[PDB]
């Protein structure tokens, strides 16, 4: 069997909001070490990489490794039926092709208990090895969303330029063009830049907007860029795991 219980249920609702809108299907890799999901969106331009360490669950049992194929829309519609304060427990009969979720209202004498069909899905995972990056920007996840949405009223693509001093997001449009300069600040409200060498890259906003759906998962977000290689937008899921989004640049 596999059985994981999460006292802060809301984490799992917040996760499936971030994803359901970017990827319909996805293969959950269950193991001792915890829960790993990696998918590309249907365009093959963005890539999602969820990690929930087993450590960060109140209860975690898992006898064999599973590959649970989940329609994320189906699973979102179900987590919609879970209160934010609810204590969510996933359970999968190993010898079964269905996944059970149990929501206990933190009290007694109310218990929702849903059960969703699983599908076969080829976990052909991609390779992502961890790297030194040229620029890393840590900033409030709000301010990153606020920026990405605001430049969408201007242009299709944002140019992210990064120095020691600060970081500059730029968009050109039909109507005009616009520039947002964040400076580095001297506790999650802070903007900070670990910088090997300057980077300027262009990314589709279309996509960065789907990523900021993860904004209610973390105080802060970190952006890791290098010359002509994918942007990594990493939302920390405090004391539990992380949700990394990879976007390919242009020219």
């Amino acid at each position: 069997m596999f059985e994981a219980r999460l006292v802060q249920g809301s984490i799992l609702k917040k996760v499936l909001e971030a994803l359901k809108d970017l990827i319909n299907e996805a293969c959950w890799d269950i193991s001792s070490s915890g829960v790993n999901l990696q998918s590309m969106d249907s365009s093959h331009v963005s890539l999602v990489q969820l990690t929930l360490r087993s450590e960060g669950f109140d209860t975690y049992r898992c006898d064999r490794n599973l590959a649970m194929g989940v329609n994320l829309t189906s699973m979102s519609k179900i987590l919609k039926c879970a209160g934010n304060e609810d204590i969510i427990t996933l359970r999968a009969e190993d010898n079964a092709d269905t996944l059970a979720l149990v929501f206990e209202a933190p009290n007694q004498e109310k218990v929702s208990d849903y059960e969703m069909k699983l599908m076969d899905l080829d976990v052909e995972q991609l390779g992502i090895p961890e790297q030194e990056y040229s620029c890393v920007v840590k900033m409030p996840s709000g301010e990153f969303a606020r920026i990405c949405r605001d430049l969408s009223h201007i242009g299709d693509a944002v140019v992210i330029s990064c120095a020691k001093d600060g970081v500059k997001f730029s968009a050109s449009g039909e109507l005009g063009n616009g520039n947002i300069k964040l400076s580095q600040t001297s506790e999650e409200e802070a903007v900070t830049i670990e910088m090997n060498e300057p980077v300027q890259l262009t990314f589709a906003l279309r996509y960065l907007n789907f990523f900021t759906k993860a904004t209610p998962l973390s105080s802060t977000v970190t952006l890791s860029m290098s010359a002509d290689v994918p942007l990594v937008v990493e939302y920390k899921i405090a004391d539990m795991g992380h949700l990394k989004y990879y976007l390919a640049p242009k020219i």
Binding site: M40, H44, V45, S46, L47, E124, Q125, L126, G127, I128, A204, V229, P230, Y246, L247, A248, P249, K250
Partner: peptide
């Protein structure tokens, strides 16, 4: 536009 299927494989 480019692909993220360009950097990482099997």
């Amino acid at each position: 536009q480019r692909r993220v299927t360009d950097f990482f494989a099997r």
